[PDB]
Amino acid sequence: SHMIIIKLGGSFHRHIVEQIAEEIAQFYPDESFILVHGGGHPNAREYKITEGLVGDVDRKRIGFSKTHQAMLKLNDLIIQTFLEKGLPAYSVSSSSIFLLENKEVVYGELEILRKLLELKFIPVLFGDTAIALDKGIDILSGDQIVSYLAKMLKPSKVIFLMDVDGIYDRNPKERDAKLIEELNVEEIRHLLIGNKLREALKIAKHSEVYFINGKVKENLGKAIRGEKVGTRLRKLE
């Protein structure tokens, strides 16, 4: 309905979080917002959590817990930044409501998020460690959380704040690239970032998708208002 999901990339830059909160404050509270950020990941690679519950099991469990705690610290920093700006952002543990199989959320709990949104709260989830029915433990990325929430909650739009202006033709590092302001299935179906494109193809069934540069503040508001900004992938037909 009148709900918007916002996903954040990677860097801790406090000023950019301040800008994101200030832009979100333009539509609170008559517009519902769910926030999702990413890594914590250093512990994810150091403990090879994606390897599963194989080999040294106890060390993998300890690293699972430590990575979750580091993600909680980063999430608390973001939460306090949002709270100082007068926004009631509430932390929701992703690993406490989600269960994966093959890097995909196959079990979820969403009544708590619904009651948070109803009471004019802003839930904030994170890419996190997670329990996986196949290989015991796994790393759940924020893109999968966004995909599941789009499957179930069906937001009005999903906005990805990236380090670059949006989806490009060539690699942004390889100059002479061009920006695609209007994205559709045929262009996304070019895979020779990729996982984000597959998740966007899955999400466009339910909601509009925006890819905008989070470094520019006003950008966020534009994507929420529907103005031309970055890359836009409309709802599929």
Ligand X SMILES: C/C=C/COP(=O)(O)O
Ligand Y SMILES: Nc1ncnc2c1ncn2[C@@H]1O[C@H](COP(=O)(O)OP(=O)(O)O)[C@@H](O)[C@H]1O
List binders of ligand Y among 9-48 (CB under 6 A). 9-11, 38
Minimum CB distance to ligand X smaller for 7 or for 232: 7
* DSSP helix/strand/coil, 44: helix
Distance between first and last Cα of the chain: 18
74, interface contact from ligand Y, its own copies, ligand X, none, CB < 5-8 Å by kind? none
Q: Pattern of binders to ligand Y over 212-231, x per CB under 6 A?
A: --------------------
Q: What is the DSSP string of the chain?
A: --EEEEEE-----HHHHHHHHHHHTTTTTTSEEEEEE---HHHHHHTTGGG-S-SSHHHHHHHHHHHHHHHHHHHHHHHHHHHHTT--EEE--GGGTEEESSSSEEEE--HHHHHHHHTT-EEEEE-EEEEETTTEEEEE-HHHHHHHHHHHH--SEEEEEESSSS-BSS-SSSSS--B-SEE-HHHHTT---HHHHHHHHHHTTTSEEEEEETTSHHHHHHHHHT-S-SEEEPPP-
Minimum CB distance to ligand Y smaller for 116 or for 149: 149
CB 29 within 8 A of CB 117: no
86, interface contact from ligand Y, its own copies, ligand X, none, CB < 5-8 Å by kind? its own copies
102 binds ligand Y (CB under 6 A): no
Q: Tell me if 7 is assigned to a ligand binding site.
A: yes
136 binds ligand Y (CB under 6 A): no
104 binds ligand Y (CB under 6 A): no
Minimum CB distance to ligand Y smaller for 121 or for 126: 126
Minimum CB distance to its own copies smaller for 121 or for 210: 121
Between CA 63 and CA 40 the distance in angstroms is 11
The strand pair at 157-162 and 208-213 is best described as: parallel
Minimum CB distance to its own copies smaller for 67 or for 219: 67
Binding site for ligand X (CB under 6 A): 10, 38-41, 44, 67, 71, 127-129, 139, 141-142
107, interface contact from its own copies, ligand Y, ligand X, none, CB < 5-8 Å by kind? its own copies
- Name the minimum Å distance from CB 116 to its own copies: 6
Where does this chain bind its own copies (CB under 8 A)? 53, 57-58, 61-62, 64-66, 68-69, 72-73, 76, 79-80, 83, 86, 88-93, 95-99, 107, 109, 111-112, 115-116, 119-121, 131, 133, 136-137
Where does this chain bind ligand Y (CB under 6 A)? 9-11, 38, 143, 162-164, 167-168, 170-172, 193, 196
